[PDB]
């Protein structure tokens, strides 16, 4: 109400919300635009996910550092402006190459392929970097200062941000469809790009204000390769390190949300509305996670929540494996059951480890460690992204699921070890 709406705790609740939705939308849009040009194959457009992984996976630590180095206002403005400009340029070039010229021959083994690939992949790198940086340079840092010394509300805000993310992630494609309907390829691109400009412009003033509000944020304290090395050594030392690893390990499992399990599940295609119902069940589990986390966090020690969520995950995965076991329709239904209960457990778990990383890290080293946490998540996600190929055969797409379950077990056991090495071995 009124004040509450102009309470910074919410203002940000939008600023980040505008960034999430818009960014996801742009990403999906470009993805479709590409696959529309060259038939989605092993090499065509498949390169895109891979290069976006690699980019951040290598560059994160140094972003996060530079963040830590500079101011708060200035760095946030640079992160936003850059992203906006990048998206704008990308859309412009896309339209230009969409209209004027669509297939010409150059010299020195150069074709609209090599040329557009280089230009758009540079644009993609820029945009992705912008989004992923505008996060550790704003999200985790702002949640730590805006929240204040007080926890309670900080954790509530973290859960709220996790929810919004799940919503946007499940609302971006839907909007992209309606955008195909009227917007199409020739104009649709131009529209979402101009929008992003508007979104970016608004976010700029929003954050200027939020900073005007809680004044704490004015307070602070081979060169790139050296910086990356320093960030990695800093991340290995921290006592939280163990749990951090656990987090990334979970980003390894393939079965979950939309991926190869969904691709093999789409093959069966129960019915057109059946897929929508499955998507709704997923989103529900994702949200019903954050509530569970908040409750447990209140009722039992934070470290303790993690272990419990872990048992939960593992249990639903018992379901999944015994399903594929088919021992003494069915198995398919069970697969989604498992992915779902997994979703709830997993999302709690993430919320905890996020809070850990959020408080047990010195002020100055805030960026670098979150940066590295990204990179590790991407590195562990790369294996799952590299697991799409080399065994894309959905025939024995059961042993790969067993391997994912094994990795999950490893991560959970690592988190259990961290917990024991933290509180008394008695729970």
């Amino acid at each position, epitope marked *: 109400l009124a004040n509450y709406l102009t309470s910074a705790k919410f203002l940000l609740y939008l600023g980040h919300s505008l960034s999430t939705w818009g960014d996801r939308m742009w990403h999906f849009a470009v993805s479709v635009f590409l696959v529309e040009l060259y038939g989605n194959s092993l090499l065509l457009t498949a390169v895109y996910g891979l290069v976006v992984a690699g980019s951040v996976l290598v560059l994160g630590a140094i972003i996060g550092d530079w963040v830590d180095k500079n101011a708060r206002l200035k760095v946030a403005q640079t992160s936003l402006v850059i992203q906006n400009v990048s998206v704008i340029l990308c859309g412009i070039i896309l339209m230009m190459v969409f209209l004027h010229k669509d297939e010409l021959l150059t010299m020195y083994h150069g074709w609209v392929l090599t040329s557009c690939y280089i230009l758009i992949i540079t644009i993609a790198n820029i945009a992705n970097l912008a989004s992923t940086a505008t996060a550790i340079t704003i999200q985790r840092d702002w949640i730590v200062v805006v929240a204040g010394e007080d926890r309670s509300k900080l954790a509530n805000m973290n859960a709220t941000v996790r929810r919004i993310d799940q919503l946007t992630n499940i609302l971006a494609p839907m909007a992209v469809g309606q955008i195909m309907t009227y917007g199409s390829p020739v104009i649709g691109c131009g529209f979402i790009s101009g929008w992003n400009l508007v979104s970016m412009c608004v976010e700029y003033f929003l954050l200027w204000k939020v900073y005007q509000k809680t004044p704490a944020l004015a307070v602070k304290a081979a060169e790139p390769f050296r910086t990356f090395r320093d960030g990695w050594v800093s991340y290995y030392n921290q006592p939280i390190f163990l749990a951090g690893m656990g987090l990334a390990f979970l980003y390894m499992t393939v079965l979950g949300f939309d991926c190869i399990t969904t691709g093999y599940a789409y093959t069966q295609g129960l019915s057109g509305s059946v897929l929508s119902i499955l998507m709704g069940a997923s989103a529900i589990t994702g949200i019903m996670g954050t509530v569970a986390f908040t409750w447990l966090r209140r009722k039992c*020690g934070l470290v303790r929540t993690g272990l419990i969520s872990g048992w939960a995950q593992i249990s639903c995965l018992i379901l999944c494996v015994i399903s594929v076991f088919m021992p003494g329709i069915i198995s398919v239904s069970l697969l989604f059951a498992g992915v779902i209960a997994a979703r709830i457990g997993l999302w709690s778990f993430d919320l905890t480890v996020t809070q850990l990383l959020q408080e047990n890290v010195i002020e100055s080293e805030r960026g670098i460690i979150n940066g590295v946490q990204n990179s590790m998540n991407y590195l562990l996600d790369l294996l799952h992204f590299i697991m799409v190929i080399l065994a894309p055969n959905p025939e024995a797409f059961g042993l790969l699921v067993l391997i994912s379950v094994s990795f999950v077990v490893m991560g959970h056991i690592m988190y259990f070890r961290f917990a024991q090495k933290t509180l008394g071995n008695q729970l």
Partner: antibody
Amino acid sequence: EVQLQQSGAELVRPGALVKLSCKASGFNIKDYYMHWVKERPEQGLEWIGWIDPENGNTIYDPKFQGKASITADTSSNTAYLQLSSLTSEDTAVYYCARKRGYYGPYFDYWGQGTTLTVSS
Amino acid sequence: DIVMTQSQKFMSTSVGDRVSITCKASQNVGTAVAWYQKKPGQSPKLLIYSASNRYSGVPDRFTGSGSGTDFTLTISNMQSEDLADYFCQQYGSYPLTFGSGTKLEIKE
């Protein structure tokens, strides 16, 4: 101005109980973990345990798990340590300290210290 | 448990001298070591956390260095407000342990 003021200067026949208090001022006991530390006469610092005032979770040093009970009251904004079955060895200065995370880099603010004398 | 060790109980120094106090873990702490100074009849105050960071408001002549297992506090150009006790705490893992301390003393 953040302070932690402690009850002071208790003298206790051995085998009894005693409860030592640590009252915070300028911050919320609930946003922190509260640690108890013991400094024997001419000896090094020793850690007794912490309590999470929100849910009341306590962790102790295995050599204090028998005869130390850390409790807290957020309403009064104060933390307590109960020592039971006292002996001659218990005489020391007890400190109350304030840490932010499970792995906060430091104890920024400390209690003034409470001399406890166990003799007959 | 990690048993922090300070070999020297005493260090005989003089004003304007660089004195280096050493602390040695029993396991790989990493950079999880902070440095407290306490004067007789007082509470320990921070100097240096995470083995290199200098807490906000302590003079610029207190330096901290080291990693892994062997750490060092370093007083450059010691003054007469520095004669005290120093000890290293490790927060790598619970139970926390403190260094047994190292008392400075002006040298005659």
